[PDB]
Design a protein around this ligand. Sequence first.
Ligand SMILES: C/C(=C\COP(=O)(O)OP(=O)(O)O)CC[C@@]1(C)[C@@H]2CCCC(C)(C)C2=CC[C@@H]1C
Ligand SMILES: C/C(=C\COP(=O)(O)OP(=O)(O)O)CC[C@@]1(C)[C@@H]2CCCC(C)(C)C2=CC[C@@H]1C
Lengths: 292, 292
Amino acid sequence: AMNLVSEKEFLDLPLVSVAEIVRCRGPKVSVFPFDGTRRWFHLECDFQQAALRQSIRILKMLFEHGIETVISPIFSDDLLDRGDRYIVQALEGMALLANDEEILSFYKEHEVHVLFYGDYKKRLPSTAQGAAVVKSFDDLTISTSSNTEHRLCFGVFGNDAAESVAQFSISWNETHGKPPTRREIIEGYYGEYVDKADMFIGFGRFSTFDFPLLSSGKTSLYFTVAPSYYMTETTLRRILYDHIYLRHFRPKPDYSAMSADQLNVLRNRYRAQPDRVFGVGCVHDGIWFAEG
Amino acid sequence: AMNLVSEKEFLDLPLVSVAEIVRCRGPKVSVFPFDGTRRWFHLECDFQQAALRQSIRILKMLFEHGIETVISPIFSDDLLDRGDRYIVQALEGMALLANDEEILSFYKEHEVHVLFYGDYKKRLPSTAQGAAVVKSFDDLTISTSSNTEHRLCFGVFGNDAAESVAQFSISWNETHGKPPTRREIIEGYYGEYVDKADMFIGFGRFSTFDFPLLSSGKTSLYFTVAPSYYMTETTLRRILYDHIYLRHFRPKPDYSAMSADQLNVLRNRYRAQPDRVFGVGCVHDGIWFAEG
Ligand SMILES: C/C(=C\COP(=O)(O)OP(=O)(O)O)CC[C@@]1(C)[C@@H]2CCCC(C)(C)C2=CC[C@@H]1C
Ligand SMILES: C/C(=C\COP(=O)(O)OP(=O)(O)O)CC[C@@]1(C)[C@@H]2CCCC(C)(C)C2=CC[C@@H]1C
C-alpha cells in the first residue's frame, strides 16, 4: 500500500500526502543544523531578521512534511570567538528564539514544543543578559509544553554530553537509589525522551555534530552542496525518499541464488572504479567542495 | 615546511615519508570499521583466515602510514541473528583476535596495544566459550600493555555507552567522592584515554557508528564505494591528504575583500546545481549505491 510509491510520484504528490507517508514510515527524528549562514549572507544581498526567516521557512518545511521532531544545532563551542560583540549578537539571536513574535506564532500555529539542550547553563556568561536567555529558554520550554504535534530541540553548546551524563547519573542515583535507564538519561539531557536520529542533513564537508545520544548506524547522512538555507522542496523529498525506500531496502540480497553473471556484473560496479571515494574534495577560494 | 606538499607529491612519496607527515599533522585517531565483508567473500572466490588477513593488511596499512590509534568496530548489536552458529562463529572470530598466531606477531611486530570496548561483558552469553573470550580480551589488553607505538580498539557491541557511562560515574563518585572528568570517563569506556576521532572511513551508505564519546564536528567522514577490504594505497593517501590539507583549510575566507566577480563566480558554484545532494543513492540487486 505504501511501498509501491515511485520517486517520480513521490515528487509529484501533494504536501499533505507526503506528510501522511512520513508520519507512517518516518523519519521520526531529523537533525538539521543551520550551516553556511554567514556565507549565505554575502550571497543574494536584514541578517538576523533574514536568517530567522529562512530558519522558520526550513523548519516550517520539515514539519509540514510529517517530521515530528527536529534536532537543530545552532551554537557550537567555537562560539568563544572572544569578540564580545560576537557573543552579544549571539545571545541576541538566542533571545529571538524565545521572545520573537512570528516565531512564537509559528510554535502556536504548528503546535511546536521547544526544547534546549547543551552545556549552555554552565558555559553562558555569568552576566545579566546571559541569565535572561537561560530563563527565556526555561520559560519557552514550559510555555510550549502544551503543544504535542511537533517537537523542536535547539543545540546550544551540545557537542558532548559525557560529563553532563555523569553528573546527571550521580544525582539520579542519589535521589532514586539506582542508576537511570537509557531512556531516563536521554530525558535528562534533552528534557524529554527523543528517539535516535533517523537522518542528518548537513552541508559542505562530510561531518556530523551536536546531537549526543541520538546517533546510530541507522542515522542516514546527507550533505547538500549549498548551505542549509538554500534547500528546496525537491532536494528534501529526494532526501526523504532515499531514506524511506532506498537506505534500508528489502528483501535483502541472496547471492547463493543469483546467476554467475549478476554476481559478475555486480563485481564490476566496484572494480570498475577501484579508488572511488566520497568525501574527498577540492578548495576554491577557501571553500571546500566535495568531488564527484 | 610541511604545508607546501601537493597531492601529486604526496601520492608519490615513500611510505616512511608519509608516516612522518601523519605523525606530525595527524590523523591521530581514525575509525575504520570492517564493512562489506560477507559480500566481499562472494566476490573474488578460506573466509575467516581470509577476512583475518585483509583485516591485518588494512590495519598494517593504517599503522604504517603514521596513524597511532585505530578504532575498529567489528561486532554490532544486530549480532543476535539468533543463529547459534552465527553466534558461535562470531565468538570464533573474536577468539582469533586474541589467540591467533600471526595476529599476535602483528601486535609485537608493530608494537600494538589492543583494547576492547562495548557492552560485550553484559551482552555476551553466560556460557563457557563466551566467558573465555572475555578472559581472552582482558588477557590481551594487558599482554600488549607494554606496546606503546600503536593502539588498536575493537568495538564489540559498542553502539551506545550512555547506560555504561551512568554506572561508571555512579561507581567512580562512590569511591572517589566526586564526579569523573571527561578524560576519566573515556578511560573508563575504552580502558585508556583516546582523543576524539579525526576521521571515519566508511563504505556504501553514508552513516557512522560504534565509536562513542570520540565523535566531533571535526571528524572528517569518508565513504568508499567498494567495501573496506577493497581499499588500496591510493585511496588511503587521497583520504589522508584531503583531511590534512583540504578539510580545514587556512587562511579562512575574506568576503569583504574579494572582487564582485569572485563572489559572483562562487555563487554560481552553488546556484549552478540548485538541488545537488550527496548521500542519495540508487539500488542495484538489493545493494545501495551513492549517486553522483
Ligand atoms: C555565527 C552564525 C553563523 C556562523 O556559521 P559559519 O558556518 O561559521 O558560517 P559560514 O561558515 O557560512 O561563514 C550565526 C548564528 C546563528 C545561530 C544565527 C543566530 C541569529 C539568527 C539565527 C537564525 C538564530 C541564527 C541561525 C543560525 C546561525 C548559525
Ligand atoms: C558477520 C560478519 C560480516 C557481516 O557484515 P555485513 O556488513 O552484514 O556483510 P555484507 O553487508 O557485506 O553482507 C563477519 C564478522 C567479522 C567481525 C569477522 C569475524 C571473523 C573474522 C574477522 C576478520 C574478525 C571479521 C572481521 C569483520 C567482520 C565484520
